[PDB]
Design a protein around this motif. Structure first.
Motif, PDB file in Angstrom:
ATOM      1  N   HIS A  38       0.856  -1.174   0.000  1.00  0.00           N
ATOM      2  CA  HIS A  38       0.000   0.000   0.000  1.00  0.00           C
ATOM      3  C   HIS A  38       0.896   1.229   0.000  1.00  0.00           C
ATOM      4  CE1 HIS A  38      -2.927   2.996   1.478  1.00  0.00           C
ATOM      5  NE2 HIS A  38      -3.859   2.151   1.077  1.00  0.00           N
ATOM      6  N   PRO A  39       0.516   2.285  -0.713  1.00  0.00           N
ATOM      7  CA  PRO A  39       1.389   3.466  -0.772  1.00  0.00           C
ATOM      8  C   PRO A  39       1.641   4.080   0.586  1.00  0.00           C
ATOM      9  CG  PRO A  39      -0.295   3.554  -2.465  1.00  0.00           C
ATOM     10  CD  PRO A  39      -0.688   2.448  -1.541  1.00  0.00           C
ATOM     11  N   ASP A  40       0.690   3.959   1.520  1.00  0.00           N
ATOM     12  CA  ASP A  40       0.895   4.513   2.853  1.00  0.00           C
ATOM     13  C   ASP A  40       1.907   3.714   3.660  1.00  0.00           C
ATOM     14  OD1 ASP A  40      -0.754   6.512   2.196  1.00  0.00           O
ATOM     15  OD2 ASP A  40      -2.397   6.029   3.563  1.00  0.00           O
ATOM     16  N   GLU A  41       2.067   2.417   3.368  1.00  0.00           N
ATOM     17  CA  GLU A  41       3.168   1.675   3.970  1.00  0.00           C
ATOM     18  C   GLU A  41       4.493   2.230   3.480  1.00  0.00           C
ATOM     19  OE1 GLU A  41       0.378  -2.276   3.626  1.00  0.00           O
ATOM     20  OE2 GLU A  41       2.482  -2.468   3.053  1.00  0.00           O
ATOM     21  N   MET A  42       4.562   2.560   2.193  1.00  0.00           N
ATOM     22  CA  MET A  42       5.779   3.151   1.661  1.00  0.00           C
ATOM     23  C   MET A  42       6.040   4.506   2.296  1.00  0.00           C
ATOM     24  SD  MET A  42       6.847   3.471  -2.332  1.00  0.00           S
ATOM     25  CE  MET A  42       6.611   5.224  -2.631  1.00  0.00           C
ATOM     26  N   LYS A  43       4.984   5.297   2.503  1.00  0.00           N
ATOM     27  CA  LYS A  43       5.185   6.625   3.066  1.00  0.00           C
ATOM     28  C   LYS A  43       5.691   6.548   4.501  1.00  0.00           C
ATOM     29  CE  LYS A  43       3.137  11.128   3.899  1.00  0.00           C
ATOM     30  NZ  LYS A  43       4.154  11.104   4.997  1.00  0.00           N
ATOM     31  N   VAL A  44       5.169   5.612   5.298  1.00  0.00           N
ATOM     32  CA  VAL A  44       5.606   5.524   6.691  1.00  0.00           C
ATOM     33  C   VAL A  44       7.068   5.088   6.781  1.00  0.00           C
ATOM     34  CG1 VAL A  44       4.895   3.178   7.420  1.00  0.00           C
ATOM     35  CG2 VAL A  44       4.674   5.131   8.998  1.00  0.00           C
ATOM     36  N   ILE A  45       7.494   4.166   5.912  1.00  0.00           N
ATOM     37  CA  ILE A  45       8.906   3.781   5.853  1.00  0.00           C
ATOM     38  C   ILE A  45       9.776   4.985   5.495  1.00  0.00           C
ATOM     39  CG2 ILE A  45      10.585   2.455   4.514  1.00  0.00           C
ATOM     40  CD1 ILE A  45       8.318   0.262   4.302  1.00  0.00           C
ATOM     41  N   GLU A  46       9.396   5.706   4.439  1.00  0.00           N
ATOM     42  CA  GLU A  46      10.163   6.878   4.023  1.00  0.00           C
ATOM     43  C   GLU A  46      10.248   7.912   5.139  1.00  0.00           C
ATOM     44  OE1 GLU A  46       7.812   8.005   0.692  1.00  0.00           O
ATOM     45  OE2 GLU A  46       8.897   6.737  -0.729  1.00  0.00           O
TER      46      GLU A  46
ATOM     47  N   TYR D   5       6.280   4.912  19.211  1.00  0.00           N
ATOM     48  CA  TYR D   5       4.980   5.440  18.810  1.00  0.00           C
ATOM     49  C   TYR D   5       3.932   4.945  19.796  1.00  0.00           C
ATOM     50  CZ  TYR D   5       4.024   0.864  16.701  1.00  0.00           C
ATOM     51  OH  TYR D   5       3.824  -0.484  16.501  1.00  0.00           O
ATOM     52  N   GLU D   6       2.728   5.496  19.701  1.00  0.00           N
ATOM     53  CA  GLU D   6       1.642   5.048  20.561  1.00  0.00           C
ATOM     54  C   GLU D   6       0.520   4.466  19.717  1.00  0.00           C
ATOM     55  OE1 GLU D   6       1.851   8.915  22.940  1.00  0.00           O
ATOM     56  OE2 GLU D   6       0.747   7.569  24.274  1.00  0.00           O
ATOM     57  N   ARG D   7      -0.188   3.488  20.274  1.00  0.00           N
ATOM     58  CA  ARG D   7      -1.291   2.856  19.561  1.00  0.00           C
ATOM     59  C   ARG D   7      -2.269   2.296  20.579  1.00  0.00           C
ATOM     60  NH1 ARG D   7      -3.380  -1.121  18.207  1.00  0.00           N
ATOM     61  NH2 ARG D   7      -2.400  -1.793  16.248  1.00  0.00           N
ATOM     62  N   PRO D   8      -3.518   2.051  20.180  1.00  0.00           N
ATOM     63  CA  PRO D   8      -4.540   1.641  21.151  1.00  0.00           C
ATOM     64  C   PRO D   8      -4.342   0.214  21.634  1.00  0.00           C
ATOM     65  CG  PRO D   8      -5.538   2.643  19.209  1.00  0.00           C
ATOM     66  CD  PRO D   8      -4.107   2.363  18.865  1.00  0.00           C
ATOM     67  N   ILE D   9      -4.795  -0.022  22.864  1.00  0.00           N
ATOM     68  CA  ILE D   9      -4.718  -1.325  23.505  1.00  0.00           C
ATOM     69  C   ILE D   9      -5.961  -1.497  24.366  1.00  0.00           C
ATOM     70  CG2 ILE D   9      -3.427  -0.469  25.505  1.00  0.00           C
ATOM     71  CD1 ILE D   9      -1.876  -3.106  25.488  1.00  0.00           C
ATOM     72  N   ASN D  10      -6.392  -2.747  24.524  1.00  0.00           N
ATOM     73  CA  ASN D  10      -7.451  -3.082  25.471  1.00  0.00           C
ATOM     74  C   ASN D  10      -6.855  -3.053  26.872  1.00  0.00           C
ATOM     75  OD1 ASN D  10      -9.186  -4.701  27.232  1.00  0.00           O
ATOM     76  ND2 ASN D  10     -10.289  -5.286  25.356  1.00  0.00           N
ATOM     77  N   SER D  61       3.750  10.755  18.493  1.00  0.00           N
ATOM     78  CA  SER D  61       2.782  10.864  19.567  1.00  0.00           C
ATOM     79  C   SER D  61       1.369  10.753  18.999  1.00  0.00           C
ATOM     80  CB  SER D  61       2.945  12.206  20.269  1.00  0.00           C
ATOM     81  OG  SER D  61       2.328  13.228  19.506  1.00  0.00           O
ATOM     82  N   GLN D  62       0.384  10.752  19.897  1.00  0.00           N
ATOM     83  CA  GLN D  62      -1.015  10.723  19.489  1.00  0.00           C
ATOM     84  C   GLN D  62      -1.454  11.998  18.790  1.00  0.00           C
ATOM     85  OE1 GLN D  62      -3.914   8.987  22.330  1.00  0.00           O
ATOM     86  NE2 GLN D  62      -2.092   8.543  23.577  1.00  0.00           N
ATOM     87  N   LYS D  63      -0.631  13.045  18.817  1.00  0.00           N
ATOM     88  CA  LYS D  63      -0.916  14.208  17.992  1.00  0.00           C
ATOM     89  C   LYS D  63      -0.916  13.831  16.517  1.00  0.00           C
ATOM     90  CE  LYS D  63       0.193  18.953  18.147  1.00  0.00           C
ATOM     91  NZ  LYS D  63       0.263  19.855  16.956  1.00  0.00           N
ATOM     92  N   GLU D  64      -0.024  12.915  16.124  1.00  0.00           N
ATOM     93  CA  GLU D  64       0.199  12.527  14.734  1.00  0.00           C
ATOM     94  C   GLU D  64      -0.445  11.202  14.364  1.00  0.00           C
ATOM     95  OE1 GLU D  64       4.454  13.627  15.842  1.00  0.00           O
ATOM     96  OE2 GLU D  64       4.576  13.051  13.718  1.00  0.00           O
ATOM     97  N   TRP D  65      -0.372  10.212  15.246  1.00  0.00           N
ATOM     98  CA  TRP D  65      -0.869   8.871  14.970  1.00  0.00           C
ATOM     99  C   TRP D  65      -1.964   8.571  15.983  1.00  0.00           C
ATOM    100  CZ3 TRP D  65       3.677   4.942  13.878  1.00  0.00           C
ATOM    101  CH2 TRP D  65       4.435   5.412  12.796  1.00  0.00           C
ATOM    102  N   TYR D  72       0.041   3.669  12.629  1.00  0.00           N
ATOM    103  CA  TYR D  72       0.612   2.466  13.232  1.00  0.00           C
ATOM    104  C   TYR D  72       0.162   1.206  12.500  1.00  0.00           C
ATOM    105  CZ  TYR D  72      -3.716   3.680  15.719  1.00  0.00           C
ATOM    106  OH  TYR D  72      -4.981   4.108  16.048  1.00  0.00           O
ATOM    107  N   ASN D  73      -1.018   1.235  11.878  1.00  0.00           N
ATOM    108  CA  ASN D  73      -1.458   0.089  11.083  1.00  0.00           C
ATOM    109  C   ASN D  73      -0.494  -0.176   9.936  1.00  0.00           C
ATOM    110  OD1 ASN D  73      -3.814  -0.184  12.597  1.00  0.00           O
ATOM    111  ND2 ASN D  73      -5.076   0.956  11.138  1.00  0.00           N
ATOM    112  N   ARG D  74      -0.023   0.892   9.287  1.00  0.00           N
ATOM    113  CA  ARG D  74       0.893   0.734   8.167  1.00  0.00           C
ATOM    114  C   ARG D  74       2.259   0.275   8.645  1.00  0.00           C
ATOM    115  NH1 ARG D  74      -3.147   0.443   4.595  1.00  0.00           N
ATOM    116  NH2 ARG D  74      -4.429   2.351   4.595  1.00  0.00           N
ATOM    117  N   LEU D  75       2.766   0.858   9.738  1.00  0.00           N
ATOM    118  CA  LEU D  75       4.077   0.442  10.237  1.00  0.00           C
ATOM    119  C   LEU D  75       4.069  -1.014  10.688  1.00  0.00           C
ATOM    120  CD1 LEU D  75       6.968   1.014  10.933  1.00  0.00           C
ATOM    121  CD2 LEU D  75       6.206   1.901  13.153  1.00  0.00           C
ATOM    122  N   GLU D  76       3.024  -1.421  11.413  1.00  0.00           N
ATOM    123  CA  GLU D  76       2.927  -2.797  11.888  1.00  0.00           C
ATOM    124  C   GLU D  76       2.695  -3.806  10.766  1.00  0.00           C
ATOM    125  OE1 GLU D  76       0.025  -2.574  14.988  1.00  0.00           O
ATOM    126  OE2 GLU D  76       1.281  -1.282  16.252  1.00  0.00           O
TER     127      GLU D  76
END
Lengths: 87, 87, 87, 87
Positions: A38-46, D5-10, D61-65, D72-76
């Motif tokens: 997905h292009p957003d995966e590429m953007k987060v890596i970059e 980074y921060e992301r949601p958790i139960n 931070s949660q300001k951005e993600w 975080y979905n894309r990074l993970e």
């Protein structure tokens, strides 16, 4: 050692093949090569690379790596592909 | 932490052994060490390293690491060899 | 993200424990923490790091990290220990 | 390539979920993403990164993600989560 590059893929099965009918981006981290779907995966890596290193992540285009000069074959031998089946 | 180095290999079986009759290049990424079996694998590693870091990847030749100074034994203890049978 | 550090070990069992009676060097590569058990393993790590980075690898001595300030506990939670058993 | 980074958790089961009622810090090393459950784990990561690199580790931070921009979905996807269960 990080890079992004493109390499052939079967558009119907998502299997890496030397003569795939489509191209996918891949991400190498010096340990493994992983498909970027997905292009957003590429953007987060970059973005993360730039924040760490102050310059853009190396990218190999199909002007450099392609079926006539498949350098991705060499890279994927030393940093094996993960999370996807090949050939 | 990346480098290329040479270490002994059995020319017939492809097994890493301390008294191999031949030498192979290996690539260390700080996590594992892996065999480099073709000069174009070495070239792609060198190219990616230079694109990331602006200088040549460290390379240890047989003038520095050899059977009388087998520093590869120490490196392969801390970054274990993967993808190939060893000793 | 690399470092060397020292942390306690049980000298009779080889298991990492908070109250070990001896100390061992460990190597962290940002992925895992691995025991360093020979002076030349430490030396090869220091040399490769210096060749890549132009400065010495970070080292945490027992002045900084010890049973009274066991920061290695925190590091080993984020980069888990490999190749050795732990409490 | 490293970041926090921060992301949601139960907050009751500790499972990563898209609509978690609480947030956790996570650590990415370019290979995987791992939960950082204690502030002292964050501190040790920050300290080691600064010693290696002479600047602060990138933090999203949660300001951005956040749930309205769930990067975080894309990074993970490109650096899969390890050591914890996910949605």
């Amino acid at each position: 050692m990080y890079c992004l590059y493109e390499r052939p893929i079967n558009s119907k099965t998502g299997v890496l093949e030397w003569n795939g009918d489509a191209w996918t981006v891949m991400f190498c981290n010096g340990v493994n090569c992983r498909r970027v779907s997905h292009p957003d995966e590429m953007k987060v890596i970059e973005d993360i690379y730039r924040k760490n290193n102050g310059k853009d992540i190396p990218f190999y285009s199909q002007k450099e790596w392609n079926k006539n000069a498949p350098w991705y074959n060499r890279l994927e031998t030393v940093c094996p592909v993960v999370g996807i089946t090949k050939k």
